[PDB]
């Protein structure tokens, strides 16, 4: 009966000179700490129990107390940064790393989990886990011919802890640690479990959330095709990180973006840009905006795949954040596109929704839309068709909105609107 | 995903 002990009884048992009494008390603590209703983490810490648990981690001759203390410490470290810090300050990192080699799979699993919480606290504890040498034994746990022979929960916990070692910025993880982990991530990205795939995609998204050199580290491993494939999955927990990673990658160079395009990503965007999940729509439109910011042949790929009508649709009706991303995509398109591509954009019906968005209470989207309109007018000048465009804008109510903006708080807004009026509506 | 998770 280790259920519902008091902290005082736990302390009494752990302070006894009896390994079995200590084990029973440690299990009682584990059971307190594993209730969903307000576990008494701070009371356990204040009783001074963390150093005892950490020392129990080293009792190789009593594997059960290793396991119970590992679990208790896992749950303490799952709390606030101060509680995780309490676990770290007790010396838990090297003890858990030692436990990674345990012959008992449930114990090494618990150590993996604990290190995942510790590293998940943030950059400093992540890098400290790395400095203590966690990566080699973690990756050794996955050095088997077929991942399918590992227990599903075991593999999921390993994948999750590895993704926390890839997570956070300021600073990003050490480059050598990323290179050490990446091959195993690539292998996990081809495993058939949805949670393993989701967390692998999240790790990749972390590693691609940085400067072009980090993106290049990832892209060099050849994972973009697999990311596109996963972009097509039915499980939303997979699509979300796959799309995040793809978008991060297309914030890179035009060559990295091109690798996304070559893998066939654009063919998925008809569904992504109409996805019933608002966040998928937003992130797909953001990705598109960073593709229409590229080369004219890449804009042309967007055209060929039939995606301009979908951008018109998102501009016409979507969550406002998605509409703002769509306005960005349009401004990038018009800034980089040929005259013919901008003409095509107009023929797909961009003008009316663009104008309708000018009555929004967001200054940035107004600036973006006005820049787009200026680019389109420039193309029209190049064609000698500025009057056609003026009439089109006037017929849908855009001229009223622009003249109203002439008298707007922001400086860039009123300057750009007055310029447009004076230049094309006089 | 969650930064940390307890075992329940």
Author numbering:
A (entry chain E): 72 to 497
B (entry chain C): 434 to 441
Extract from the study:
Active transport of proteins from the cytoplasm to the nucleus is mediated by a family of nuclear transport receptors known as importins (or karyopherins), together with a number of ancillary proteins including nucleoporins and Ran1–3. Importin α is constructed from an N-terminal importin β-binding (IBB) domain and a C-terminal NLS binding domain featuring ten armadillo (ARM)-repeat motifs. The W proteins of henipaviruses share a common N-terminal domain with P and V proteins, but have a unique NLS bearing C-terminal domain that is recognised preferentially by importins α3 and α4 (KPNA4 and KPNA3), rather than the better characterised importin α1 (KPNA2). In this study, we present high-resolution structures of importin α isoform adaptors bound to the NLS regions of HeV W and NiV W, providing insights into the molecular basis of importin α isoform specificity.
Crystals of the importin α1:HeV W complex had P212121 symmetry and diffracted to 2.2 Å resolution. The asymmetric unit (ASU) contained one importin α1 chain bound to a single HeV W chain, in which residues 434–441 were bound to importin α1. The interaction was mediated by 15 hydrogen bonds, one salt bridge interaction, and buried a surface area of 683.5 Å2. Notably, despite binding the same region of HeV W and NiV W, importin α3 exhibited a 2.4-fold more extensive interaction buried surface area than importin α1, with 16 additional hydrogen bonds, and six additional salt bridge interactions, consistent with its > 50-fold higher affinity. Both W proteins interacted with the major binding site of importin α1 and α3, involving residues PPTKARV of W and ARM repeats 2–4 of importin in both structures. To gain insights into the basis of isoform specificity, we superimposed the structures of importin α1:HeV W and importin α3:HeV W, and found the structures to be highly similar, with an r.m.s.d. of 1.1 Å across 411 residues, except for the positioning of ARM repeats 7 and 8. Notably, in importin α1, ARM repeats 7 and 8 are positioned closer to the inner surface of the NLS-binding interface, whereas in importin α3, these regions are positioned in a more open conformation. Because these ARM repeats provide a critical point of difference between the binding of importin α isoforms, we investigated why the W NLS region did not bind importin α1 in the extended conformation by superimposing the HeV W NLS from importin α3 onto the importin α1 structure.
